[PDB]
């Protein structure tokens, strides 16, 4: 028997070990493949009550390859090191977010 340690969790893909930049590339490849619109979001503090983070630039409407979304990730990581950042995927037919996962911790 083992007792479960207390951990502060971060929505989808947080119970898996922290993601490698290759695992990052495969999950955004899935966003552009299904035809959804990938975007970058940042916030100072992470809490269950607040449901709007500060949007980074615009949703990248013209995204051909998954590398263009990775370069937008590293430029925000450089600008705000002490911020929470996550990448989302808007769908245009069903008017809802498909995917929401957290990439950098302060």
């Amino acid at each position: 028997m083992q007792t479960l340690p207390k951990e502060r969790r971060y929505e989808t893909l947080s119970y898996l070990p922290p993601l490698t930049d290759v695992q990052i590339e495969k999950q955004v490849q899935y966003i552009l493949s299904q035809g959804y619109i990938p975007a970058v979001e940042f916030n100072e503090v992470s809490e269950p009550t607040e449901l709007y983070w500060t949007l980074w630039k615009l949703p990248l409407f013209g995204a051909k390859t998954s590398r263009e979304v990775l370069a937008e990730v590293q430029s925000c990581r450089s600008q705000y090191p002490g911020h929470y950042i996550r990448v989302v995927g808007f769908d245009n037919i069903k008017q809802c977010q498909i995917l929401s996962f957290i990439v950098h911790k302060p």
Binding site: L4, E11, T12, Y30, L51, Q97, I98
Partner: protein, 435 residues
């Protein structure tokens, strides 16, 4: 004067599919004209009062007979009912007019309603779901993945405080939701108001811990309509995002006043399908579940139990989620149903599943469904908190594998065993629930 094959159904008309088994020596035309008559403006004799009202306009009539392949005195009946004769925004009437006393007719041994089509004009009168799928994900802030629920065992026995602690350990590990059993109401051993107060202390505790929005379905089902509304006044008061109800047992009218109230107040409602197995079980007699699923979507409901797995089950699952669904006779769907922008109801999968059925249920149900483990979480060797982290890591593994582009039918047993290497809690559960 009830059997008219030449008739061509209109768009503002409700159409029904009956599987008929007549008494031997009864023709295929007369037993078809008898259920078309006995459901709407039908009488055993000619009465004089029929000459003042226009009988031709209001009457339901059989337009098509199809004999069932490989079956003797077994055929499908298609009857069309004018739109005007039903009352507006009430399941109670459509249920009452059609499938009233056409059942238990002396002319026929066995009868089964297979399907029911709603014209769009009739669909508009109802509220439908108080929220729907798209609305529901937005209030809870959860995307990408199927949602995870938990049923507390045993069903009746625990004190209000013991219930409060058994719920605390489960959401702590990383379950989305916890659930009350379908037969717990206001039992002498735990009164509802005490259960409602201790569950409130354990959600706020695990909310400030893990840092996510957590919930618990508070069964509201009550004998009278005052008690039901009054219990719900208390759940709103403790700021509870969700409650739940059994619609079949309380009745459609009980379920109706509730949904109006729930849209008024912005609480999400779970629906359990208690007492379904007595009507929809027999393939010769009863009403098919897909009829009752529609009736639910229209009554209103944010969640609904669909039952665990096959060709038949995906028929009425895509029927509750999609805006437009096409006629497919192999799947089990007889008519073209078109929903007028009405929000979708989320599929709930519960009843005897462990961490090895995990690859099978994410692929078939997809993304917009709730996966609920009754016996699979509590019965962990290490307790409720490790049993939860076990099922959480196993879902997130299959969802990551699916995106990258792996077939979970082929590499289904493969992704569960890789994940079992770096997490201790899944290694002891893979051992226990074997193949």
């Amino acid at each position: 004067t009830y059997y008219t094959p030449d008739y061509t159904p209109k768009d503002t008309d409700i159409l029904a599919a009956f599987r008929v088994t007549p008494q031997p020596g009864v023709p295929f035309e007369e037993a078809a004209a008898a259920v078309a008559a006995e459901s709407s403006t039908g009488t055993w004799t000619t009465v004089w009062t029929d000459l003042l009202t226009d009988l031709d306009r209001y009457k339901g009539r059989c337009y098509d007979i199809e004999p069932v392949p490989g079956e003797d005195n077994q055929f499908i009946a298609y009857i069309a009912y004018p739109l005007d004769l039903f009352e507006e925004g009430s399941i109670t009437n459509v249920l009452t007019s059609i499938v009233g006393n056409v059942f238990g007719f002396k002319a026929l041994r066995a009868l089964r309603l297979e399907d029911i089509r709603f014209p769009v004009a009739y669909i508009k009168t109802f509220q439908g779901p108080p929220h729907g799928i798209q609305v529901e994900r937005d209030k809870l802030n959860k995307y990408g993945r199927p949602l995870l629920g938990c049923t507390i065992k045993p069903k009746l026995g625990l004190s209000a405080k013991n219930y409060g602690r058994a719920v605390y350990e489960c959401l702590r590990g990383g379950l989305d939701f916890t659930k009350d059993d379908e037969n717990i109401n206001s039992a002498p051993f735990q009164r509802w108001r005490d259960r409602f107060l201790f569950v409130a202390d354990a959600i706020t505790k695990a909310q400030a811990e893990t840092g996510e929005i957590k919930g618990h379905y508070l069964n509201v089902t009550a004998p009278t309509c005052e008690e039901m509304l009054k219990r719900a006044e208390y759940a709103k008061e403790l700021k509870q995002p969700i409650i739940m109800h059994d619609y079949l047992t309380a009745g459609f009218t009980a379920n109706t006043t509730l949904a109006r109230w729930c849209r008024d107040n912005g609480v999400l409602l779970h629906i359990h399908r208690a007492m379904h197995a007595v009507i929809d079980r027999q393939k010769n007699h009863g009403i098919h579940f897909r009829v009752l699923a529609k009736a639910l979507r229209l009554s209103g409901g944010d969640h609904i139990h669909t039952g665990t797995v096959r060709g038949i089950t995906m028929g009425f699952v895509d029927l509750l989620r999609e805006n437009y669904v096409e006629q497919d006779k192999s799947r089990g769907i007889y008519f073209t149903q078109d929903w007028a922008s009405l929000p979708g109801v989320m599929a709930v999968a519960s009843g005897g599943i462990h961490v090895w059925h995990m690859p099978a249920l994410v692929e078939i149900f997809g993304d917009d469904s709730v996966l609920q483990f009754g016996g699979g979480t509590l019965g962990h060797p290490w307790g409720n908190a490790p049993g939860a982290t076990a099922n959480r890591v196993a879902l997130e593994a299959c969802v990551q594998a699916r995106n990258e582009g792996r077939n979970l039918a082929r590499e289904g047993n493969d992704v569960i065993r890789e994940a079992a290497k770096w997490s201790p809690e899944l290694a002891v559960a893979c051992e226990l629930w074997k193949e």
